[PDB]
């Protein structure tokens, strides 16, 4: 007889995730609304102690704006007798894979959500201030390129008053950066180390592969071969706990779709409700070509 152990290999990668960085907000019935405090107007004037009167100042705006939340639905069958036999539990696996697919679709939505019935992605919305690299004039052509100087000047130019802000990019980008060399043949940044290794634990490096990389796979743009493609996205940096907000309404729910199911079949119905919006995009900044 065969032996049964209690381990299960997965061998399936989801992605890197950016749902932890965004400002989490739990909500209720749809059409949420909140405040948009615009700018505190200069109230005082400063005073010499001579006059028996003050002077007024400009007021500010509030702009109680709002937003809608979107939903996610799905259905799937099951045989009835096939479920009692066939020792493995198909039901829990379907539940888990549905929650996971919903999670990955949520992650894709918050980044590149295309407007209509799609949580407006902060990439396509584009109210973030964006800087771009400068081209280099190799043998008199001024081709678009990118070196570490542009990276620093992008990361440092951030106003530290906003608080500590996280920077995100693709792992192909991290690799291409780490693969930079001086004229000596010596390394570049991330110098002293046979380690390199993207620790990235909290400090300013963070990687997601389900972001658009400007390396077109690899060995592209930047490479001894064909030059780089301009206008391509590179990286972002924001205080996501306040730069962009993700809103949740109802956990993934499943239900036996009574009606359409019989003593020989079962039909199910699952759904959930979530969304996201931009917070103060005047915090985060983007790097392009």
């Amino acid at each position: 007889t065969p032996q049964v152990l209690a381990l299960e290999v997965d061998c399936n990668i989801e992605c890197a995730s950016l749902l932890d960085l965004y400002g989490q907000i739990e909500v209720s019935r749809s059409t949420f609304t909140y405040m948009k405090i615009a700018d505190y107007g200069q109230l005082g004037e400063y005073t010499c102690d001579a006059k028996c009167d003050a002077e007024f100042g400009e007021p500010g705006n509030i702009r109680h704006l709002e937003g809608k939340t979107y939903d996610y639905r799905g259905v799937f069958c099951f045989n009835r007798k096939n479920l009692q036999e066939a020792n493995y539990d198909f039901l829990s696996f379907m539940i888990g894979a549905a929650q996971r697919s919903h999670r990955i679709n949520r992650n894709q939505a918050l980044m590149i959500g295309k407007g209509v019935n799609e949580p407006k992605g902060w990439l396509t919305e584009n109210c973030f201030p964006v800087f771009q690299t400068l081209p280099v004039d190799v043998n008199g052509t001024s081709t678009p390129a990118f070196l570490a100087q542009d990276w620093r000047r992008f990361v440092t130019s951030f106003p530290a008053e906003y608080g500590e802000a996280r920077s995100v990019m693709h792992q192909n980008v991290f690799g291409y950066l780490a693969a930079m060399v001086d004229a000596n043949g010596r390394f570049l940044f991330g110098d002293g180390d046979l380690t390199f290794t993207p620790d990235l634990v909290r400090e300013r490096i963070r990687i997601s592969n389900c972001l658009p990389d400007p390396t077109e796979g690899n060995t592209k743009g930047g490479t001894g071969q064909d030059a780089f493609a301009a206008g391509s996205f590179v990286a972002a940096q924001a205080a996501w706990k306040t730069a962009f907000y993700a809103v949740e309404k109802r956990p993934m729910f499943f239900e036996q779709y009574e009606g359409g199911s019989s003593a020989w079949c079962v039909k199910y119905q699952f759904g959930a409700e979530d969304g996201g919006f931009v917070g103060c995009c005047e915090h985060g900044r983007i790097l392009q070509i």
Binding site: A179, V181, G224
Partner: peptide
């Protein structure tokens, strides 16, 4: 209508990225 198969012809690849 499905199965899986492979033998280890995972011929290694190069990377080079100069500046």
């Amino acid at each position: 209508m499905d199965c899986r198969n492979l033998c280890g012809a995972a011929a290694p690849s190069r990377l080079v990225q100069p500046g």
